[PDB]
Symmetry: D2
Subunit: 115 residues, 4 copies
């Protein structure tokens, strides 16, 4: 599992459950093509987005649909979504964990990259 | 000044200076049009991006070129850039401050709307 | 102004106003002595805590009463307060800005030393 | 396992390994008494600090020795340590995960609290 997303809710002190996540890969022309998508589980995690074989070198965008999340909670948040754009696997296969911490007007994102 | 950006460096404990910032507005056809751009100053701030007249309701993207910033410091960064996408909503008089706190493998962004 | 505190509210996207802040210096015998205190202003800032003459090298603790802040907003917080403990080091002319970004179950603090 | 600590390094994009963590409990007089201590593992996690039986209601302070961590890496950091002070178990036993994200001049801490 080379690409994992973990999302926490800083207002409730809990995992952010059912957050939609879309991943895109920058194509040979500089259009973002859809790559994978999913929703966080009860633990706020999203696994199984892709495989080592499919997860080739490139620039990827992970888009976390934070707006829908906060709206469903009755909070009107600032951001449309949180997005994380990174070059992946440019010197060999790595495992990427993209973690995000969400508040209505703020989010933080961190990457843990393992060999 | 309806839109201000402030960028801090969490590694050195200093403003992030000379960081390129590009602002885009979403156009009618799903597409991002250049709207404003600048480089953060010595205090890590960027002002005078736009005016109240010009800054109408819409979806905006603030793109902070964090990669070049870290590269200049000889530190290999994770992100291609930091992006902040938000709807400017205009109901009442509103100043938007977009602040980013930069680390090589992490960033945080917060909006202060006053 | 050698020491400044700024507190932001990540839930409402606003300065955190009227937040009590207490600053302590570590004394000779391992113990924390009151040093300065105040309440953040309408811009979520606290200035004039101390002077250059008084702010000597030492270990300082900045305690931000985040609990009362959230309680006033009817939101149950996790932390008793936020604490920031650092050595003031004085080598060269230095202003310390301590910024805190508050959420009910999380906070971030960063230091800007310029 | 009612109290867990997870520590990440935002400079290296990796878990923060071998970070010393001391936990204190506020005593019947308002002195912090030592409660538990340990070091983060290779995954940046610290488990087994305490048991449900021992982890009674009270105010706890988790102190993360960030200074030693950064010094061992040749970075001179700002903070002496990161500390998280919270009331625990005041309406029944909960499981607490204290997560911290470390940079030389900044850290963030979040709590995930589960039933
Ligand atoms: O800011 C944070 C961010 Cl963005 C993520 C985490 C975090 C907490 C628990 C886990 Cl298990 C992981 Cl992977 C992360 Cl990255 C913790 C903090 Cl304090
Ligand atoms: O995480 C933070 C972020 Cl994203 C921003 C700031 C911050 C520091 C100084 C200033 Cl002047 C401002 Cl407006 C901000 Cl929002 C402080 C922290 Cl701790």
């Amino acid at each position: 599992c080379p690409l994992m997303v973990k999302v926490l809710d800083a207002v409730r002190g809990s995992p952010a459950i059912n957050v939609a996540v879309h991943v895109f890969r920058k194509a040979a022309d500089d259009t973002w093509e859809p790559f994978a998508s999913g929703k966080t589980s009860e633990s706020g995690e999203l696994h199984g987005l892709t495989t080592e074989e499919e997860f080739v070198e490139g620039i990827y965008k992970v888009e976390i649909d934070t707006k829908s999340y906060w709206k469903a909670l009755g909070i009107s948040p600032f951001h449309e979504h949180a997005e994380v754009v990174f070059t992946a696997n440019d010197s060999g296969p790595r495992r990427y964990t993209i973690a995000a911490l969400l508040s209505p007007y703020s989010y933080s994102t961190t990457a843990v990259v393992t060999n």
